[PDB]
Structures are given as structure tokens and as C-alpha cells.
Design a protein around this ligand. Structure first.
Ligand SMILES: O=C(Nc1ccccn1)C(=O)N[C@@H]1O[C@H](CO)[C@@H](O)[C@H](O)[C@H]1O
Length: 812
């Protein structure tokens, strides 16, 4: 069955023979193992090396091709690359999946069992990091000379353990058994400088007396979809510089301090912590990367041509130091005059904003910058003076606008606003969904928009249909290919052809069949890995994303308790059985998010053990939500929970994954949800709740949660259950902080959307009772998910910002 899937390619007889041969070669020469001692892990690694060999020729040829053609080079700078696993992706993109599947089968091995051995490269927190990963895939698929640049964290996002119903954090030791995908490049190691002081002298400024940390690059291949393109992700690793008993020994041990720079990912989602170590990581990436950029530019054939040959894309403000660093290099080292260097810098750099919440913005204390990067602070100040001079010329006498626009923020602690730096130093600034990009121009960066309107753009997010359809849901990819062929895989708009099958009995049957297959497989996963049983004949109601108050997992909690309370009130009344699944990691220092996880498990402790409820309702917390788990649960989902307060989710991308994979969406008019509903037709989406206009109206008069409590008996009941200790009998006051926040300090207006949410959820159950109509609406969703391919997104970046033309053209 497995092998009959045509989108997975051909199992050529000579290819299968060669693969088996090389599998065995690696087991022997690479792993130094025999079939007598060899474990499943050994067999995974033998396959990984075998598959990896197939990238090499294309990888060398692609990079040679870019040297010869000399196209404009795109440098995508990010502190996060949420790559997930690599084995299946490589096989898919090289058309090797069926061949390896046959090869391993003939050797007596189940390739899917082998795939489960691979650790995620979890070098990101969530959506922003995953966007970077989808972007790398799409840029390679679109034949762009693009280079992902970041940091090789020794430890990615922490592994989440649930113990006693609480999140526990453990180190994500992803490199324990090695990483067969990366190629260490110690020969290309570069120096990065910290601290020191500035000397203004004969030639000008000089950054001296610095402490050096070496940046060692590790290069990872990024294969395009069956176009023979293999691009590169370069990730820098921190290495101590080359040059008494206790004294000598301690000096050697103290090398760890420098090397700590690339030790661990800061696990924050939509929140800025001004840690010096984070600032070092950010500069580490920027300094080493820009050295590569300058050197490669010089090896291509005076800096007037720089922006024609270089694009630097800033993934949020995290690599914003690229702006003053480029100025520093061009002025201090290359000896260009300020004006020309600045012209070059702005044309080279572009900035992507992912944020709404004020506390998410990077605002570094000037004292920290003065100490760590004294020359960069000097340059920032000069940038600010000339930029504010431009504001003053454009808007004479508008003093508050000057204050609002300044890169320098006054207060008890004087800070540099890095978003302001990015806008000033970039020729393009984009948000990540239409609603978000509009609000950047409307309110958040209104004054910047008024000064330079041409700067502001939209680039609605997307996801790769390779990982997010072909890999994770081959069954759905196949039934689609059976009707419309395979072109849609890198031309997702072709999914619109599926609207011709809304009344096709065979397709309706097959869409529902695939979903049920995915649900059985996920149920099997939970039983195998956690001994957790879920009802396969229940609606799979899924909210998976990082735990944050704005994403309103708490609103989901209120609904779950509503369903429970309604069953208890009328036990004889039929309800559509549900398995409510919530998963996601909380930032270790975010108390409320940690309490919310505990509430989910505590709700489950009551609901899942009430005999009156039985298998009619179950609430489970999915442990350790990560890219590999997303690939499992999303194809199994019936209902996608996308319930952020309107105006808070910049775009979302998990929403797109669900839409592509045959789940229907319950959601607010927020982020990309708006455009998803536009594409499919609002009649095909479960839209509920306040619009942004309604939220703003509430803000204008003041949000009083008490009013909702007083007017809604069912909500009142739930709050009193939480307060009295119904969900924490051994510790009655456990959830007092949650109750207090909801009643008095709720920034995200949970109570305000409660009634519409519950009513909307009733309509979900009503449609689910009609399998034919559920499935027909699903078809209308899958068929219109095309816009949300990251190929579309990247094509827009290329044409509208980078000035390069994408190409699906194959290499020899
Ligand atoms: O801002 C983010 N992380 C962050 C912030 C500060 C410090 C560290 N990390 C983030 O993940 N933003 C997300 O970017 C996604 C891709 O565009 C959007 O789809 C999603 O709406 C948005 O919340």
C-alpha cells in the first residue's frame, strides 16, 4: 500500500540495488557495525548517510552554478531555524522515497520506524523559526541563490516533560548521536569582536582592545523540489580564540565562557528579555555573516554595485545589528564616506516585522550597547541624528513626531529601539499578513509610514506544501494527484481545480477515508508512545501552538468546561463526541502560561474520569509539541483552533497547515485567518467573536470582565468551579491567579468572546453530525489553500523586495 503512492517516486531496480549496497557500505565503513550488533538507530544512520550522499553532487554543482551565473545573492538572517527532521524531506525533494522504502524493505527494515529515530533540529521557538525553515525550502525550490544564516545552538527549544500536570524543562541535546546532515567547516572560521573601545585617529575610527570569539560555520544542504538545486544553511558555532597550575587549568576551562554564546536558544515567544548573552548571540550571527557577504562580493569580479549583488533580509529585529555593522565595515574598514555607505546599506537591507505586543519589541539599554559594542552605539547615534534631521526637514516644527520616531528612547533607562533602527536602515519593511501590515502603516509605525510610504509592504506568510502536505500527509497528496497530477506540489494554486469535485462521490469518499486513516495513525502513536487511549470515533478538536495569553488557550478551557457542565446537566442529551487536544510549550519564566498548562491537565483529571461522561468528552495535553509532532497531529485534525484576540496574532502559520490538511477552522478575524476565510468563502469557516473594531471600542470605554460574569450564568458557574477548587480539590486555591487575571487584569478579553465562541462551537458540532456536508466544506477549504504556499510568499519577496526573478527551472 505504502509503496503504491505515486507522488513518492519510482523504485528503479538499479537504484534500489545501489541504495542497498551503499546502506551496507555505510553500516560497515562509516558506523563500524555488523548485522549482529546493529540497532534500529544504526540503521537510521546508515540510511541517513546513504541519502545524504545523493545531495553532494547537486550541492557542489548548485554553488558552482551561482559562481558562474553571478546572480544577486539573498542572505536570510535569523536567530531561529525550526527545521524539524531531514531524512524524509531529503528523500521527497530528490524523488528517492519509494526507492529507499523498497531498498530498506528488501533489507528487512521498516523505513518509517527508522524515520522515527531522527531528532528534530529544533533551533526555533515557533512560527517565526518555522517560517524561516519554510522560506529556505521555497527559495531553493524557486531557484534563488539564497543563503540562510544563523546560529548552531547546542541546545534548541527545551524538551517538554509533563509531570504531575506541570511543564518541566529538559535540555534538547539534539547533537547527542551527531548530525549527519551538517558539514563542519572549521577552515572557514572567522573572528567576531566584543567589548573594547573606539580610537578616533589618522584614518578615522578604530575598534581596539576587543575580546575575540571565533565563529565556526556548519553548512547544511537545502534541497529544492526536484529541480536539482541544493542551497546552503550556514549556522555559526562559538569557539574560543587560539591564544601556575590552577591558573593555566582555569584559563582552559574559561574557554567555556566564549563558547556559551551558541549554547542554547532563548525560549521566548513574543517577548523581549534584554539579556546580554542574547545580545552577544545576535551580534555573533551578524558579524560573522557580514564577513562572508563582503568577501563573497569581492570574489565576484566599487561598492556601488553592492546592493545589486547583495540582499540582506532581517527576520525580525534580532539581526538588526547588521545595519550598523555594515556601516562599520564600509566606513571604518573599507573607508567609504558616510553618505555612500548609508545609500548602500539601506538598499541592501530589508526588515520583516512579526510583532504586535509592545513587550515583544527589542529595546536595548544604551549602557549595555556602549560596553559590548561601543563603535556600534556611536554609529547608531549618527544614524539617528541624520534620520531625525530628515524628519525635521519633512515635518518642520513637529517636535513630538521627532520624539516618537527617534531610535533613542528616553526614560529611567535610555534604550535603542531596534525596530526604529531597522525601518531607518531598510528600503523595505513588511508585515506578515494583510491586517498586520496595514496596522503597521496605520498605528504602530504611522509616522514612519508618513515619512516613507514606499517602504511599507505586505508579505502574507505561507507554509511549504512539501513538508506540510507531501511528507506529513502522503495519503491526501495522492488522492489529489490522482485527479489533478503532481504539478500542484510546487504550484499550489492548482488546488483550486479540486472545487470541481465538491459533488464527486469518489473524492468525497476518499477525502473522508484519508482523514480517518490519519486519525487511526495518531491514535496509534499516542497508544504506542504514551499508553494514552483516544476515541477514534470522536471529533479531533486541536489547539497546537506556543502557550500565550493572547492565543487564548484559556478560552478553549472555558469551552471544554462548558461541554462538561452541559453533559452533567443533561446526561441523556446526545452530543458529538470530542477529543479536545491542546499542546505547546510555555516560556520557562512565564508563570501564567505554566498555570494554563496545569489547568488543561487538571480539567482532564476531572473530565476523563467522570463515568457519566465516558468517551463522549476527553481532554488531553499533547506533550512536547514540536515540528515532528505537528506533522503527526495536524493531518489527524478535524477542528483547527485559531482563537487569538482580534489584533494580536500577526499572521499565524499553523492555521495554514490545518487548512491544507483537511481540518475546518474555528477562529477570530485575526492575522491570516482573514485571508484564509476570504480565499475559501466565509461560509466555509467558523468565524466568531469581536473584530479589531470591537476590541478597540471596548478599550475606549474600558474592559469590565465583571459585566460578562454577571450576565452569563454558565460562565459564572465555571469561574466558581475554578475558585472553589473543583479542578484542584487537594489545593482549592491553586488557580486563584488565573481567576484574578480573568476577572481584573485580562489584556485579551477572554470573557468578551465566550458566548459567541460557545455558540460557534455548537455550529461545529451541528455540521459534524452530517459527514457528507462536513467533508464537502473540507474540500472547499483544501481547494482554496493555494495562496498559503510559501512559494507564493517567497516569489513576492523576490519580485517586490529583493529584485530577483524566481524560476522552477531544473538544473542538469
Ligand atoms: O515574535 C515572535 N517571536 C519572538 C518575539 C520576540 C522575541 C523572541 N521571539 C514570533 O514568533 N512571531 C510570530 O511570527 C510568525 C511568523 O511571521 C507569525 O505567524 C505569528 O503571528 C507571530 O506571533
Amino acid at each position: 500500500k505504502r509503496k503504491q503512492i505515486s507522488v513518492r517516486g519510482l523504485a528503479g531496480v538499479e537504484n534500489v540495488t545501489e541504495l542497498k549496497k551503499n546502506f551496507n557500505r555505510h553500516l560497515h565503513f562509516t558506523l563500524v557495525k555488523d548485522r549482529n550488533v546493529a540497532t534500529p538507530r544504526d540503521y537510521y544512520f546508515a540510511l541517513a548517510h546513504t541519502v545524504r550522499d545523493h545531495l553532494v553532487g547537486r550541492w557542489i554543482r548548485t554553488q558552482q552554478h551561482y559562481y558562474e551565473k553571478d546572480p544577486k545573492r539573498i542572505y536570510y538572517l535569523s536567530l531561529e531555524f525550526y527545521m524539524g527532521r531531514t531524512l524524509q524531506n531529503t528523500m521527497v525533494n530528490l524523488a528517492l522515497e519509494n526507492a529507499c522504502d523498497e531498498a530498506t524493505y528488501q533489507l528487512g527494515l521498516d523505513m518509517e520506524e527508522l524515520e522515527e529515530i531522527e531528532e528534530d533540529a529544533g533551533l526555533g521557538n515557533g512560527g517565526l523559526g518555522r517560517l524561516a525553515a519554510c522560506f529556505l525550502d521555497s527559495m531553493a525550490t524557486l531557484g534563488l541563490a539564497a543563503y540562510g544564516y544563523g546560529i548552531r545552538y547546542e541546545f534548541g527549544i527545551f524538551n517538554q516533560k509533563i509531570c504531575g500536570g506541570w511543564q518541566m524543562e529538559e535540555a534538547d541535546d539534539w547533537l547527542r548521536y551527531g548530525n549527519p546532515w551538517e558539514k563542519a567547516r572549521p577552515e572557514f572560521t572567522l573572528p567576531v569582536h566584543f567589548y573594547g573601545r573606539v580610537e578616533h585617529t589618522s584614518q578615522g575610527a578604530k575598534w581596539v582592545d576587543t575580546q575575540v570569539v571565533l565563529a565556526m560555520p556548519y553548512d547544511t544542504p537545502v534541497p529544492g523540489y526536484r529541480n536539482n538545486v541544493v542551497n546552503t544553511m550556514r549556522l555559526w558555532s562559538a569557539k574560543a580564540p587560539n591564544d601556575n597550575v590552577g591558573g593555566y587549568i582555569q584559563a582552559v576551562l574559561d574557554r567555556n565562557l566564549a563558547e556559551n554564546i551558541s549554547r542554547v536558544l532563548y525560549p521566548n515567544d513574543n517577548f523581549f528579555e534584554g539579556k546580554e548573552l542574547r545580545l552577544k548571540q545576535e551580534y555573533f550571527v551578524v558579524a560573522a555573516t557580514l564577513q562572508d557577504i563582503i568577501r563573497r562580493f569581492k570574489s565576484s569580479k566599487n561598492f556601488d554595485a553592492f546592493p545589486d549583488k547583495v540582499a540582506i533580509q532581517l527576520n525580525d529585529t534580532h539581526p538588526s545589528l547588521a545595519i550598523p555593522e555594515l556601516m562599520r565595515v564600509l566606513v571604518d574598514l573599507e573607508r567609504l564616506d558616510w553618505d555612500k555607505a548609508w545609500e548602500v546599506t539601506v538598499k541592501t537591507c530589508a526588515y520583516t516585522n512579526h510583532t504586535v505586543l509592545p513587550e515583544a519589541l527589542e529595546r536595548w539599554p544604551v549602557h549595555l550597547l556602549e560596553t559590548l559594542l561601543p563603535r556600534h552605539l556611536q554609529i547608531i547615534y549618527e544614524i539617528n541624528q541624520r534620520f531625525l534631521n530628515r524628519v525635521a526637514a519633512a515635518f518642520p516644527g513637529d517636535v513630538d513626531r521627532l520624539r516618537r520616531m527617534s531610535l533613542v528612547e528616553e526614560g529611567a533607562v535610555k534604550r535603542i529601539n531596534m525596530a526604529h533602527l531597522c525601518i531607518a536602515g531598510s528600503h523595505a519593511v513588511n508585515g506578515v499578513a494583510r491586517i498586520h501590515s496595514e496596522i503597521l502603516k496605520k498605528t504602530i509605525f504611522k509616522d514612519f509610514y508618513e515619512l516613507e510610504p514606499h517602504k511599507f509592504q505586505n508579505k502574507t506568510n505561507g507554509i511549504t506544501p512539501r513538508r506540510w502536505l507531501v511528507l506529513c500527509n502522503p495519503g491526501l497528496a495522492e488522492i489529489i494527484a490522482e485527479r489533478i497530477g503532481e504539478e500542484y506540489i510546487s504550484d499550489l494554486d492548482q488546488l483550486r481545480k479540486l472545487l470541481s469535485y465538491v459533488d464527486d462521490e469518489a473524492f468525497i469518499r476518499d477525502v473522508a477515508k484519508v482523514k480517518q486513516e490519519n486519525k487511526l495513525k495518531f491514535a496509534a502513536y499516542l497508544e504506542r508512545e504514551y499508553k494514552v487511549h483516544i476515541n477514534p470515533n470522536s471529533l479531533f478538536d486541536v489547539q497546537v501552538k506556543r502557550i500565550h495569553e493572547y492565543k487564548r488557550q484559556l478560552l478553549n478551557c472555558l469551552h471544554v468546561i462548558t461541554l462538561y457542565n452541559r453533559i452533567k446537566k443533561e446526561p441523556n442529551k446526545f452530543v458529538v463526541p470530542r477529543t479536545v487536544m491542546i499542546g505547546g510549550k510555555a516560556a520557562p519564566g512565564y508563570h501564567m502560561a505554566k498555570m494554563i498548562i496545569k489547568l488543561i491537565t487538571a480539567i482532564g483529571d476531572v473530565v476523563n474520569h467522570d463515568p457519566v461522561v465516558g468517551d463522549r468528552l476527553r481532554v488531553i495535553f499533547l506533550e512536547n509539541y514540536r515540528v515532528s509532532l505537528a506533522e503527526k497531529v495536524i493531518p489527524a485534525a478535524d477542528l483547527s483552533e485559531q482563537i487569538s484576540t482580534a489584533g494580536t496574532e500577526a499572521s499565524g502559520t499553523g492555521n495554514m497547515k490545518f487548512m491544507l490538511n483537511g481540518a475546518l477552522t474555528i477562529g477570530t478575524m485575526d492575522g491570516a485567518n482573514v485571508e484564509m476565510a476570504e480565499e475559501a468563502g466565509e461560509e466555509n469557516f467558523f468565524i466568531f467573536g469581536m473584530r479589531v473594531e470591537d476590541v478597540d471600542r471596548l478599550d475606549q470605554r474600558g474592559y469590565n470582565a465583571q459585566e460578562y460574569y454577571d450576565r452569563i450564568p454558565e460562565l459564572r458557574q465555571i469561574i466558581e468551579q475554578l475558585s472553589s477548587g473543583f479542578f484542584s480539590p487537594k489545593q482549592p486555591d491553586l488557580f486563584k491567579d488565573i481567576v484574578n487575571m480573568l476577572m481584573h487584569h485580562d489584556r485579551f478579553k477572554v470573557f468578551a468572546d465566550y458566548e459567541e465562541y460557545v455558540k460557534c462551537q455548537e455550529r461545529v458540532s451541528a455540521l459534524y453530525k452530517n459527514p457528507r456536508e462536513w467533508t464537502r466544506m473540507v474540500i472547499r477549504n483544501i481547494a482554496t489553500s493555494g495562496k498559503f504556499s510559501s512559494d507564493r510568499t517567497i516569489a513576492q519577496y523576490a519580485r517586490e523586495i529583493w529584485g530577483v526573478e524566481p524560476s522552477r527551472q531544473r538544473l542538469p
